[PDB]
Design a protein around this ligand. Structure first.
Ligand SMILES: [Cl-]
Ligand SMILES: [Cl-]
Ligand SMILES: [Cl-]
Lengths: 57, 61, 45, 67
């Protein structure tokens, strides 16, 4: 009853740590998506600038 | 009739905790795999842009 | 002929200016993607 | 001397004209090289956009799909 108490406390502590680490890593994926969305926008602008130039050649 | 049910209840909560830990580790690994793939893809695009810049410098000179 | 060379010379200057700006845009894009790579390396402990 | 000088002047013009013709050729070739670079970079951009879009799609799948 004494060593099961400790073992169970550690398990729940490890579970809680993983739950928090997953919330944090999910936020980063959501930030990486937004950052990709802005990189996509940037390259589409350069693409239109080039299309604008090439039509005249 | 209590010290048995309580022991069974504890053994089951322990299995459930470890099972939740395993599932959280798997989900974390899937998210980490995705970040590593994104990093790999960026390294690939950088290499592609750097080559195209070199080809651009070649025609300029 | 003389007039042709002059026209071509001016067209080439204009197009070379366009590649010059394009080169700078690629340097910018490379710089951005390296910044993002550096951050992911960080996020990845 | 006067007459000889004028002929020389004519032969130098043949030289100049030849130099001009070859300059026109060099300029045309370089203009094409530069246009071909822009055209391929436009295409490479289009492929880089499409690849970042797929990376975003794969990122979104991980965020919303669940085992
Ligand atoms: Cl532990
Ligand atoms: Cl159950
Ligand atoms: Cl999952």
């Amino acid at each position: 009853r004494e060593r099961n108490k400790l073992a169970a406390a550690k398990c729940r502590n490890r579970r809680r740590e993983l739950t928090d680490r997953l919330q944090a890593e999910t936020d980063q994926l959501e930030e990486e998506k937004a950052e990709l969305e802005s990189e996509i926008a940037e390259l589409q602008k350069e693409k239109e600038r080039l299309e604008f130039v090439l039509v005249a050649h």
